[PDB]
Design a protein around this ligand. Structure first.
Ligand code: HEC
Length: 86
């Protein structure tokens, strides 16, 4: 549905259809969302902080700069969690 469409349209280019990082995402330095070790290293609040505020890393565009509806943040975090263990 709508959240999966948003992921396909403005996240998958970097994060990949499998969450592991496309060739582009690996060039930019995405994490591996399928890694259980990566997943458990971040709380949901920490993910949301990065997505809302940006990080120290100049390669990461905060999601409001991508134009993403702020109401999509929580479901996008849940979608990212969905890659865990795949
Ligand atoms: C390339 C241009 C990207 C697009 C489009 C999106 N993301 Fe991304 N993301 C990217 C990088 C290079 C990184 C790591 C380095 C950094 O920029 O900070 C990330 C990181 C994330 C994370 C992890 C945050 C954490 O605290 O561990 C999440 C949860 C994330 N990205 C989600 C995400 C979503 C939902 C996107 C579409 C709306 C999206 N990203 C786009 C690179 C790129």
């Amino acid at each position: 549905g709508d959240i999966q469409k948003t992921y396909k349209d403005t996240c998958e280019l970097c994060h990949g259809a499998d969450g592991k990082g496309s060739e582009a995402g690996k060039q930019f330095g995405v994490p591996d969302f399928t890694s259980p070790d990566y997943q458990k290293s971040r709380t949901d609040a920490q993910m949301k902080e990065s997505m809302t505020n940006g990080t120290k890393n100049p390669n990461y565009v905060k999601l409001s700069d991508l134009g993403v509806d702020l109401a999509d943040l929580d479901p996008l975090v849940q979608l990212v969690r969905g890659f865990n263990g795949k």
